[PDB]
Symmetry: D2
Subunit: 425 residues, 4 copies
């Protein structure tokens, strides 16, 4: 039905192993990755990556989120960077195969006691320029997140707040920070100066584990491919660090000086893409899913119940994809928390939700712009078929494949409750 | 509430080891779920009265066994008529009507090598009288099952064949027998004379384990409550044997002389019902589900994929039931093989499938009698509502409960592919 | 296959086909069940002790000799019936039958004597008849007391007090027979030497359909605590009048052993029944089959995980010795013990290897029958001048008795457990020895 | 306080996810650093005074890279290492043995090259402990190295360096005939795609752990420290992850051979390794290693598993083992006990070589002998206890597991004892 060649690719012999030791022993350098790269790449925009032509190459290389570092540069400089990112992204709207949403993240300068005056003005600039995400620098407690949230004025409540943990207090007050944040960034640069350098891996692994448990996005950042600022190829420790951040459970990986000021920005993005695909296939899904299942509390929320049912169904048939209809991105995020091997194709009419779901591992957003059908069930079926035809065009799906389809019983967000098993025709 | 997590051995269910599970079993933790292991009662002089059969149905009898080792065809035709009269006396209330299967247990080959001439005549009688199941005595090899199947003819294709394993050869050729049978009976009476008595528990536990792995019904039979032929209460070894057969994984438990000729036929049924409910709550679902999940092969069949997704969803929300629409019983059987704690409420129009699904643990058949609605989606919804109304009347469901609803995309058998999370209103 | 490949070449494929070894090496409990084989014959000596109630059908010296040969390890005297004179004669007849085999020390089988009390009746605590019966037990040197209707910790303190200063060595097994005993189980087990699941009264005091829950819970808690647990009443009931038991009865005996019972019991089946010797033989045959079907892989992992961390060297040595025995499929673990405690701590980890306990205490040799898999050897030789030589002679006595009983063969590996100094409480050494 | 240190809350966790969630930057390491550090000797680390600081910083094995330098250059490096090591021999209870490893130039465009035959002969003549054989592609390459060592170099350990696709594909046959493996990531990262090296590293470490044979992770672990005083975030992560993967040894090349901060690079690997060792999830690791090790009738194998099980049961501070060749200590090390394996030996070479096995702390016994063999055994066990107390491994009240044999000579380990300190 599938063949022996299918079960040799994407580390499938290591995936079927009964123990983690046997899983390690079965990892094969000849077993090629087949799935689309699921860990998003965040690239910092700067002099080396600001031009429209350079940004087109970075989008082609795999950049999903553009980071604007407000520690340097004026509002005029950042507005031009945003315009250049949007021009490069929209240059592909002519091809359904190549077009892809790209999120814009504003990384704040940081705090002084409460929110700094500059952070109030920069956060206001972010709302006025329609940024998708804020990477809030030096978050130490829950009230720091509340201050950032308050500064997103009356118009920016939909912006995602990713709290950067950069010091001892942020690590010790992690639970209260995660509770009020949309996600976390393990900001290793400052963390490695604030706490002993030999302890950063403990903070990284703990925070990734807690974010995976909570079902909230976690970003691993700083010096991942540092030597690539001046060299065309990274060190053995750098490729290892990127692979290990993905294996740890990071939803996103980041590039700072490598893309902002370095001599090889496109090559750094290509390297993170290549390593992430290899590491995602080496994830031990058998124990990971069992542990996420056991640790996740019992739930009476139908979206959560449908998500675990759909992920279980996808593993049973080695589904190529889980197609989900989502307005806010929440139904796709709840599928992503169970770490399915199947790609989560999220069909949405919200351009902002399509950009923001790049924060969740394995979510592939498809922005739907057709006019709504008069009969709701027909409009649902057209979106499901749009996800199928996009998957066929992009290589995720072929005729005869099985896909899992996740929908709700009525229009509007919060009603996901249906899982279907569909044969691709 | 806290009261919910104290009942049905839920503290023992959440235990991390089987030792801790045993240590947490509580005699004060009352069973809440409906009794899932079916009871087979042998019909005889003590249970032929139509009025006594009505009491046995109320006590919990699901399958009526006709032992063709004794009595003429005229005697068995009267037993069938009496069973049907008692069963159909409750048809006036469709929301509470309980289907009861009729099983024909053959005399056997005796000294011969294959199908006896009396068995050919008895099997023909079974087809002519519309029996649901055949318990084929002394099955020693796959060709014995083929001979029974051939003697049933073209009109008996829908009859389930349960092979009785009663000797050393049947145990040694178990795998080839199970492959061609619908299920197995561990016929301990003859097995305990054919092999050393001290080895029967090994054959019983092995056969139940292999049937559970194959997802095929297994019956534990003979002397389970033997002393109740003459005494009002059973021995400590008898209650232990019934509880251990359920814990082993038996889909059905049986009564022979206890209901056929004894003085306490209704009390013997009530005793098996009471013990089975206690033992089902003491099942260690945590390890059992994990092992059944791991041992079940990967599948591209949408019914199989939907079934595991629905069982996983039911465990996530502590669903009171999985309501499934089924024509042949197959969709309910595939749910049952994963041993959900949630009751599998199977709604069917087939009177025969409603009787036959009693062979699968935890399947509660509801016979739907209404003619099809003009709109197929409304006909589906009406059957789901019938499952809910029957469930509320019978005590399976209450307002506020969560239920998993399993349906298909088109009419006819073989198209189950949808799982839905529904709140009971 | 790789985890058992070199051992399969050395010991042979026939070795790994016996005693349910394919089911023992299974990775899941489901696969373990699927691999159980009626053609896989038991090889190990029967480890679950049999308690037989003495009465008119089993009182004669000649009948008792046949019951000892059939497998009786503990003789129960039911003080609910019979006078002190009747029970003293039963004790004398048991001792005469047991000592008729003392002429061959390498094969002599110790047999314990247990006194089962009448109980409190309608009273709240220790009855006056129980005080007199317990005093009789001490005067007649009984090894164990099965205390009827224990409902709380103070009931076992009262039994202990009635035994007096001369009965400090007697083991107290509390009988749980009602709802209160089940609910106060933890406090009762804490002060008792062990427990008896007394299913007769328990099945009348609580709903009959709940007894299996109480049995499985109490056996699990006793296994966790490392204290003996007895399953009792109606196990082979039909054998009181019939030569063969029912299918439910053989299943009940097998399931009590699989549950984790250290001992199984016969009441009317041996006391007044027509087939006392056959009932003992039946429990022996079923127990050997069920012991081989135990899923040691998960059982040992769970007993290790659940057992608390310990700084007691006897406890630490015991787990190391059981781990070593599993690693090499050891035929036996030979242990030197004064009180039986070192053998009990090995037994709590449920090794497949027989625990051959060499002791000079005749009472400890009888009492260790309460612990599953402990085979007591009574050493009669006087102490050597050099203590290290005396230790070695006792280990050699265990090996020679083991060879002359079928437990050991040349080429087998045995684990030897000893201590660093004389006296009880100093076990701290584990040795791997090849049998020559 | 005991259960708050060395990541003990994360150690008691029921799942790997919960283990990760419980890792605490405030939980300080207490155990001695288990993973050995291999430092490459060169112009930056050749002086006797510099070597004394590197030994104090944690260097356990000195690597001589025969790709550069003459035989005269390497003989002087060996003499300087031995002078620095023996400068601490005046205090036998704290003396740290240091192994000398010869890393070959390799076959180049050719089997065994003529330069490798001469270099291996030099190694035997100068008493090297280990050979890191470059570019091992098959079992016959190991046999050729073994033959070039001759009858005098029978005791030298051969660690095969896997540096290309063929070495990875023929890994099982190479490991079978080798004493251990080195994941030589420099050449491996050029021979196979750079993004696949982590797969080869994790697979080889897993297979070596399964076989109970030493595995070394090597190259660019702290690369930036060649010119900078502090490493990058990816470098500290790489060192920690090599230890978590299961590497027995970690290595420094240019960082110690030619860099500006050789002592600081050793101190950094020591600091990270201690943190990572405490974060190892022993609950699942021991269970998997125990399940996967085959059933055995060898008494040393049977005693080792019993001793490791006993150590976990009582939270033993150490397992003291008497060993002639190092084999009894290696069999204890394969189960990854949290308890330090204190190996007391009379063989100076075995004391140096056991640094290849994680958690083996070699003590070179140089005390006068005893007339009664049993008394000589007791004296070696007391020397292990006294050295353990002096070094901080043991305190009064601690429990230790003692592993010995029934007769003199190698191959007779069969006894395990539980001893209370003082
Ligand atoms: O390791 S065990 O052997 N059996 C553990 C065990 C039992 C039951 C389950 S199950 O999840 O419900 C399950 C049932 C049927 C399946 O098809 C199936 O896939 C799963 C799973 C595991 C054990 C461990 C202990 O710690 C102990 O005190 C007692 C026992 C014990 C020993 C022998 C027995 O036969 C027995 O009844 C109990
Ligand atoms: O028992 S272990 O500890 N491994 C633990 C282990 C690692 C990974 C998984 S995961 O399913 O991918 C998983 C990932 C993230 C989760 O959130 C998650 O829920 C699950 C699962 C388990 C061990 C066992 C071995 O046999 C061995 O050779 C090596 C190791 C090893 C290796 C790495 C370590 O960090 C370490 O401490 C030890
Ligand atoms: O993930 P979200 O934001 O809850 O959106 C899921 C929603 O999408 C749907 O599938 C389709 O809804 P719309 O037709 O309003 O887009 C709903 O049935 C469901 O509630
Ligand atoms: O379990 P079976 O026999 O495959 O029946 C399941 C079938 O029942 C249905 O849910 C309802 O079908 P009908 O309307 O024909 O009764 C189908 O969609 C599905 O294929
Ligand atoms: O099991 P117990 O009662 O603790 O007895 C174990 C004792 O037996 C011995 O092995 C031998 O002691 P004895 O010489 O007193 O018989 C002691 O070293 C050890 O302390
Ligand atoms: O680990 P190895 O090389 O087998 O050495 C272990 C040996 O050391 C001893 O403990 C002591 O032996 P020596 O007295 O010869 O040093 C032996 O009993 C044992 O066989
Ligand atoms: O701000 C950051 O990204 C950091 O400190 O790593
Ligand atoms: O035929 C039967 O039912 C038996 O033998 O048990
Ligand atoms: O007293 C007893 O032994 C009983 O009730 O089982
Ligand atoms: O030879 C080496 O050490 C390498 O290539 O890493
Ligand atoms: K910033
Ligand atoms: K029949
Ligand atoms: K009594
Ligand atoms: K070299
Ligand atoms: Mg920062
Ligand atoms: Mg029969
Ligand atoms: Mg009683
Ligand atoms: Mg190289």
């Amino acid at each position: 039905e599938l063949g022996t060649a299918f079960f040799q690719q994407q580390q499938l012999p290591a995936a079927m192993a009964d123990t983690f030791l046997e899983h390690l022993c079965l990892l094969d350098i000849d077993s090629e990755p087949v799935a689309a790269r699921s860990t998003s790449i965040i690239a910092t925009i700067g002099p080396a990556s600001r031009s429209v032509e350079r940004l087109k190459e970075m989008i082609k290389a795999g950049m999903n989120i553009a980071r604007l570092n407000f520690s340097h540069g004026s509002h005029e400089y950042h507005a031009e960077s945003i315009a250049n990112v949007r021009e490069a992204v929209e240059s592909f709207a002519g091809s359904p195969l190549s077009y892809r949403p790209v999120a814009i993240a504003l990384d704040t300068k940081g705090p002084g006691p409460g929110l700094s005056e500059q952070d109030v003005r920069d956060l206001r600039f972010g709302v006025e320029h329609g940024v998708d995400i804020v990477f809030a620098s030096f978050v130490r407690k829950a009230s720091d997140v509340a201050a950032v949230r308050a500064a997103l004025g009356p118009e920016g409540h939909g912006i995602k707040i990713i709290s950067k943990i950069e010091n001892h207090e942020g690590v010790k007050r992690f639970d209260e920070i995660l509770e009020v944040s949309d996600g976390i960034m393990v900001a290793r640069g400052d963390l490695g100066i604030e706490i002993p350098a030999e302890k950063v891996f403990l903070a990284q692994k703990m925070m990734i584990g807690r974010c995976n448990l909570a079902g909230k996005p976690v970003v691993c950042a700083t010096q991942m491919l540092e030597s690539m600022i001046t060299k065309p190829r990274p060190t053995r420790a750098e490729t290892s660090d990127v692979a290990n951040a993905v294996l740890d459970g990071a939803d996103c990986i980041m590039l700072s000086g490598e893309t902002a000021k370095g001599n090889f920005p496109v090559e750094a993005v290509k390297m993170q893409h290549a390593i992430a695909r290899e590491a995602e296939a080496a994830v031990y899904h058998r124990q990971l899913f069992e542990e996420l299942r056991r640790a996740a509390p019992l739930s009476r929320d139908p979206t959560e119940v449908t998500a675990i049912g759909a992920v279980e169904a996808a593993f049973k048939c080695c589904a190529a994809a889980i197609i989900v209809l989502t307005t806010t991105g929440r139904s796709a995020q709840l599928l992503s928390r169970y770490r399915p091997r199947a790609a989560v194709i999220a069909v949405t009419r919200s351009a902002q939700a399509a950009r923001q779901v790049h924060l969740c591992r394995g979510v592939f957003p498809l922005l739907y712009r057709e006019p709504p059908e008069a009969i709701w069930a027909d409009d649902v079926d057209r979106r499901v078929q749009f996800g199928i035809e996009s998957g066929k065009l992009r290589g995720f799906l072929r005729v005869g494949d099985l896909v899992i389809v996740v929908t709700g019983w009525r229009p509007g967000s919060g009603y996901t409750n249906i899982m279907r098993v569909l044969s691709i025709s």
